[PDB]
Write a protein that binds this DNA or RNA. Sequence first.
RNA 1: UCUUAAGGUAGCCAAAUGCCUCGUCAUCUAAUUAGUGACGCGCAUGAAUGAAUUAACGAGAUUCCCACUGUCCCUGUCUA
RNA 2: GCUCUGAGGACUGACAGUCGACUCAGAACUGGUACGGACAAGGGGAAUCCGACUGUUUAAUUAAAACAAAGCAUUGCGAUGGUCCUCGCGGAUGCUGACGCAAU
RNA 3: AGAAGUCCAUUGAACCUUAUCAUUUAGAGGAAGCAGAAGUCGUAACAAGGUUUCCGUAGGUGAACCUGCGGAAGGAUCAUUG
RNA 4: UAGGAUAGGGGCCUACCAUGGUGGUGACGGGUGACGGAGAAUUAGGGUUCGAUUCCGGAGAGGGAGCCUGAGAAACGGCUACCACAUCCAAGGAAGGCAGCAGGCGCGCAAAUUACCCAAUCCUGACACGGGGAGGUAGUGACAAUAAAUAACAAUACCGGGCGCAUUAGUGUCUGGUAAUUGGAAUGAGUACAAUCUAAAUCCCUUAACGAGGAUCCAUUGGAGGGCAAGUCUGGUGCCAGCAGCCGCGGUAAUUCCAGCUCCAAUAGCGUAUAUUUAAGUUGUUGCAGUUAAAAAGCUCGUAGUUGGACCUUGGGCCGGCCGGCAUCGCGCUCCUAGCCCGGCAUCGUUACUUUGAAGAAAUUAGAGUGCUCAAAGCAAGCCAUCGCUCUGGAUACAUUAGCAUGGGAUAACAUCAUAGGAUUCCGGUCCUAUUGUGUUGGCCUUCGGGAUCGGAGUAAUGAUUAAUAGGGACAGUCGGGGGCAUUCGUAUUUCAUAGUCAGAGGUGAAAUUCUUGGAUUUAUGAAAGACGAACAACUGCGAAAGCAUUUGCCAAGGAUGUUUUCAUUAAUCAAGAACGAAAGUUGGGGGCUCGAAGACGAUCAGAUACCGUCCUAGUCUCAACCAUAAACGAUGCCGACCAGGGAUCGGCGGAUGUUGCUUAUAGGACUCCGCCGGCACCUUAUGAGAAAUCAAAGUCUUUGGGUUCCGGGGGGAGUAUGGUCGCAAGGCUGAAACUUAAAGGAAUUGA
Lengths: 150, 128, 138
Amino acid sequence: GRMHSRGKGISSSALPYKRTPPSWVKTAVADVDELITKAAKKGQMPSQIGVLLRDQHGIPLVKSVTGSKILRILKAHGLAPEIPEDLYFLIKKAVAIRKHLERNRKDKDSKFRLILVESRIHRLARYYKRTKKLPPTWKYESATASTLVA
Amino acid sequence: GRRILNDALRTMVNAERRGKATAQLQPISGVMISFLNIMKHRGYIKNFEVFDPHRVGKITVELQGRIKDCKALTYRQDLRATEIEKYRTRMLPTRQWGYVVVTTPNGVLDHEEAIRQNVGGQVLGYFH
Amino acid sequence: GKTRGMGAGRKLKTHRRNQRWADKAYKKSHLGNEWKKPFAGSSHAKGIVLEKIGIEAKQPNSAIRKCARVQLVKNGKKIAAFVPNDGCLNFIEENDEVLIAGFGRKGHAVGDIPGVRFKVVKVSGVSLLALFKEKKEK
RNA sequence: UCUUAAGGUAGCCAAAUGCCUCGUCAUCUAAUUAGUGACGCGCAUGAAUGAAUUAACGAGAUUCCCACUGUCCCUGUCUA
RNA sequence: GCUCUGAGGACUGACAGUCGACUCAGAACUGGUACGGACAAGGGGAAUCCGACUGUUUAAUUAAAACAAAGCAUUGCGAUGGUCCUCGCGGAUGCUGACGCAAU
RNA sequence: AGAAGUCCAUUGAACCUUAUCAUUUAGAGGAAGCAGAAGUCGUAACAAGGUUUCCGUAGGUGAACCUGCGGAAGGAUCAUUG
RNA sequence: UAGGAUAGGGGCCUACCAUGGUGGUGACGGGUGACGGAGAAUUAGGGUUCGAUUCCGGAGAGGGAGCCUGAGAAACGGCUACCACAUCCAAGGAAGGCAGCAGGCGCGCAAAUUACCCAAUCCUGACACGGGGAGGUAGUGACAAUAAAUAACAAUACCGGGCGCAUUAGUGUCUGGUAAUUGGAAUGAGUACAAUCUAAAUCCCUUAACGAGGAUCCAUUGGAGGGCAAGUCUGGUGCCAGCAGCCGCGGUAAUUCCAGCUCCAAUAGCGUAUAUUUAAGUUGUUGCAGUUAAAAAGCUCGUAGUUGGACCUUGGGCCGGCCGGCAUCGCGCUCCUAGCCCGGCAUCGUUACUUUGAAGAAAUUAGAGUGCUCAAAGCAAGCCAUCGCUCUGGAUACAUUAGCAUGGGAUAACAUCAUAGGAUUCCGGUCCUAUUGUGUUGGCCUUCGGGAUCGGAGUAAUGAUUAAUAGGGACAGUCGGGGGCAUUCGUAUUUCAUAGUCAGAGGUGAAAUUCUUGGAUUUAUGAAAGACGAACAACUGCGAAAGCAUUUGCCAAGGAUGUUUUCAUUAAUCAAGAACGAAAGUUGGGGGCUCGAAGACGAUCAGAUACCGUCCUAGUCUCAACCAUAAACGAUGCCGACCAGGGAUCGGCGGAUGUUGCUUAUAGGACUCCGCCGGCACCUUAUGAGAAAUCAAAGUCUUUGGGUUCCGGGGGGAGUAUGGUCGCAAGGCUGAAACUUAAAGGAAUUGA
Ligand SMILES: [Mg+2]
Ligand SMILES: [Mg+2]
Ligand SMILES: [Mg+2]
Ligand SMILES: [Mg+2]
Ligand SMILES: [Mg+2]
Ligand SMILES: [Mg+2]
Ligand SMILES: [Mg+2]
Ligand SMILES: [Mg+2]
Ligand SMILES: [Mg+2]
Ligand SMILES: [Mg+2]
Ligand SMILES: [Mg+2]
Ligand SMILES: [Mg+2]
Ligand SMILES: [Mg+2]
Ligand SMILES: [Mg+2]
Ligand SMILES: [Mg+2]
Ligand SMILES: [Mg+2]
Ligand SMILES: [Mg+2]
Ligand SMILES: [Mg+2]
Ligand SMILES: [Mg+2]
Ligand SMILES: [Mg+2]
Ligand SMILES: [Mg+2]
Ligand SMILES: [Mg+2]
Ligand SMILES: [Mg+2]
Ligand SMILES: [Mg+2]
Ligand SMILES: [Mg+2]
Ligand SMILES: [Mg+2]
Ligand SMILES: [Mg+2]
Ligand SMILES: [Mg+2]
Ligand SMILES: [Mg+2]
Ligand SMILES: [Mg+2]
Ligand SMILES: [Mg+2]
Ligand SMILES: [Mg+2]
Ligand SMILES: [Mg+2]
Ligand SMILES: [Mg+2]
Ligand SMILES: [Mg+2]
Ligand SMILES: [Mg+2]
Ligand SMILES: [Mg+2]
Ligand SMILES: [Mg+2]
Ligand SMILES: [Mg+2]
Ligand SMILES: [Mg+2]
Ligand SMILES: [Mg+2]
Ligand SMILES: [Mg+2]
Ligand SMILES: [Mg+2]
Ligand SMILES: [Mg+2]
Ligand SMILES: [Mg+2]
Ligand SMILES: [Mg+2]
Ligand SMILES: [Mg+2]
């Protein structure tokens, strides 16, 4: 179940059986890689990259066409986001919630949600500290966190 | 959370007790199929599919109604080959039938095999 | 349910240590108040009787159970003790030297005698059964 | 049962408010009309006439303990 | 008391040279156990009553438990008004206006 | 060589004062619980217990208890398409 | 760090310096009626409780402290001092230490001789000779334990059941017994010549003579309602005496008391008391329970802790009768183990788990042998012609945990190849030590051997498992009375005003208090105030719970759905800690309609401090700040899986043709049908579960084990006292004991 609610959804994306790409995917891995780096230096995260390819450029899965995940192409070309995808977006959501709350002091629901979002941030940040994808000192300061994002 | 080899055996008990012909198992394991090999060797279930397309896996066993109970002892014990002798009495229905499956450095094997190879290990479970 | 992790030995042992205290027998036996009772962890106790009293009997019955107020030579407690034979009270007399034992139910009031936990088993150094049976007169 | 407009509520007390009074009990002392703490049918206690407490503070009033001492036993002497 | 030891700095060319008024600790010895040696300079504690505190007061017999105090409450008043002075004209609050003035 | 004595250290009993801990024990008065009996005042609860019961909180009353606000059915309704 | 001291390491101590050490894995502190262990009792297994005590270790000799001698002592059957105690004194002085043996006092429920002995076991000395209250022997010893007497056998008898016929008898077989009936046999308890035993006696073992008539050579303990075995015996007592562990008996016919007979259970033993084990699956890891019987925290977050998805070759074979060795698509070894070019060789990730081995003190326990006569025991003893000696044994096991060592790598944790600073035979550059060409010691040097460093070429499949019906994040169209700020509206209630009308109005079952010809009630129009948001409105939605229903706007947030997007285990539950938490309540502003604790009245009633009716303060509302509880409920913790059926319904999505008072036509919106997920629920049935009520989750439970938190151990006393802590206060959280009690309680049945 969702880790911070009693919701129990199972909606998701079910990956196709065949790991190999379909016939009609005939654009070359180098050109796909250049598309990845073009949009990355244009400033989009791996989620936006995958969606963009899946929608306009007809690339089902970049791992299927290339053998390397979006983040791995970006890490190899040195365009990878400094702060990971999901930690970035949890920080951005915490900044939004705290900015709203600082003007709406009676918003106990927003105070609860901020407790939950910062809880998620800190749980995930411990993971990234243990897997060394973040600096061993990176600490989420609520004060000067809005500079980091947005 | 999941701690399968219980999610498999309890499914099998429920299917048998309802009299279903085939039961399917959502995760698999090398340990799981090695347990089912003990069952099939000792003639308690008949042959079965192991659907390994791409993921954790899936299995389908056909029950012959010859099984009666099968369980996992999560909280997997320590177990010497000198002192299975009071697990066999503590769990199995009698000293003639029933088998206690203990994982040992020679792979998954039942306690009568453990007497003759004289190797102990950890309880995976049992069936009788 | 229970905690059955293979590494939960600390939790289970602490939990039984903590939960044995609700058990009345364990609490009574280790709380240390048994040494604050009159006998203070003794089977019998020689004491001096103050007076032959006689006391009421409880609701369903109706009678006068003939007890005595005794003082304990060992620690000065004054208590009430029964005299368990027919008309045996006459043998007891004021300021005699008696042996007081538990009256049954292990320090808990017995039968229809209200709030009395003790019985007289000797007086003036002579067996009280022997007094009852004329085997030996004091 | 008579009667009032209402019948002294929460509290509190021989209190700086109690005549009887040196109230009764306990404590303090060898001995206490004093002090404290309780008891209240309280001559004549009592609620912003403020009631009950209240740490700190007081050239405020009262009681006791320790140190100290010519205040005293009991006076003596010295200096201006 | 005396004889020491240690630490704390400045200026000049992790060092060298020059200078430095003080403070703080520690030790050995010494004396008729005397040492804040004169001067200066809290007696302490257990409680009760009263007033919260600070403050003010009967100059020349009463310095307090009295008065004041903040705190609390009440009353009048929206300017053609409230409280008040004035013999009269006029005036104080008011260079103000209810988070204010006035009377308790 | 060598004793009494003596000096300075060191170990240090033992006593003394305060502080404090712990175990028992006294206390006028206040106020709990229990047991007893052949008591007084009520009628609170169990039926719709004669005001449905009860939970939390606040105030009151000789006593059970009463009322106010919110909640529950362990309700006296599993029910408005009649 | 340096030293001092010690026999010696060491803050053991000194001088200087640093600021460290332990802790929720429980330090420090407190209790212990606590010496530790080998072990004892009980035990199906697991456990629970105990262990002062004869074996080992430690500590003390009245309490502390300090030393001599000596190899060895902080000795106490050695000394010095103090404190407590006390002895002799001729009054100055002096001697002390039984928790050694024995013995005396006291304390107590509680514990024996002021004996003998060196003979054994050993110790000790200068020592074959001495000494030994160590130790042995003897006296008291129902501590505990063992064997085990109190009669046996015969015919007679009133008799008593078949069996020889079994009728019709009659007597018949083991003898069953009331038989002190009759009878001779057997013996040890006891007495005792003697011998043996003994260091000397004593006991035991042998045995001259003595030693049984059933009253004695006498068996008791407790019980006779239920449990629980054994009186619907007799007399006495009369809710008394008394019994009774509990239930209960006794109130003049007592199966229950006091007695006699009879009987019963155990039997030289049994009852009683306390403590403890079992019972007790009433402490539950094996192995309990939490909807209603005691028990899910109000709810969520949350660190430690506990628990953690799947994936990695031994895949197929030979070979000999459970396994050796083999080969296949086995990173190398120089060296010891190293073939008749070759098995089976070093160093270059940890643990757990598991197998085997070693070492493991005996006594205890298990257990082998053994005829102390058996038995508890003991470790002996057994067979020669039982003639100058043979054969001897005096086993073996267990010993959890910690440590050492060998084989395995299934299972489980830790650490970690993606920056390649990776692996790789080599080639020489930096610099080095030296052996055999230094026969003597050798010391720097050219190819050499080797660390270290070091650049470039080289090869290889050159190196990154999947993407969970785990989770996070993104994205799209949504949905929701989810939240906050502002904002529009609605009638109604009250008040007030303007107008009209006239005797009543309000309220009740009926009244009265109350308002009213100073015009109440009623009607219309309108304004102010504050509250509330009808109907729609539901077995419907949203929210973590509390809770959230007028409108629009804004602000952030959210579940589900969809997804061929991403991250790749990041997760589940969570002591400490943290956020929200109805109503009441508290501090202080604003507001003050309605309603309304307290309070005041009128009724009722015996009372009426209540229900009923009028007025009404706080309050109800809002703000700022507290409080932290509710039958905060589903009396049902959280995540996960399986299992049974259906129609509804909520949101999302997908697929159907078939009509819209829509749509420039279609799509889309409403509606009909079918299917997926995720919700809130409901209806039927046990094949299940349960004490049942009942429950499709309270099932998958004695065929008991997915993970995790909290929490109960009969009813009271009691959520009380005391302590702590938080709070302005109310109070909240944490929270006993004494004593008392035999039932309290849950579900269902019948009756009333
Ligand atoms: Mg799921
Ligand atoms: Mg969680
Ligand atoms: Mg018990
Ligand atoms: Mg009774
Ligand atoms: Mg009064
Ligand atoms: Mg008075
Ligand atoms: Mg005086
Ligand atoms: Mg007084
Ligand atoms: Mg008066
Ligand atoms: Mg007055
Ligand atoms: Mg007043
Ligand atoms: Mg007055
Ligand atoms: Mg003053
Ligand atoms: Mg004056
Ligand atoms: Mg003056
Ligand atoms: Mg004026
Ligand atoms: Mg009633
Ligand atoms: Mg009622
Ligand atoms: Mg009812
Ligand atoms: Mg009332
Ligand atoms: Mg009222
Ligand atoms: Mg009911
Ligand atoms: Mg040193
Ligand atoms: Mg001790
Ligand atoms: Mg010893
Ligand atoms: Mg000693
Ligand atoms: Mg000594
Ligand atoms: Mg001695
Ligand atoms: Mg002795
Ligand atoms: Mg008898
Ligand atoms: Mg009897
Ligand atoms: Mg009898
Ligand atoms: Mg019977
Ligand atoms: Mg009895
Ligand atoms: Mg009986
Ligand atoms: Mg139970
Ligand atoms: Mg309950
Ligand atoms: Mg709940
Ligand atoms: Mg954690
Ligand atoms: Mg009118
Ligand atoms: Mg709705
Ligand atoms: Mg509406
Ligand atoms: Mg509660
Ligand atoms: Mg609850
Ligand atoms: Mg739908
Ligand atoms: Mg209880
Ligand atoms: Mg019931």
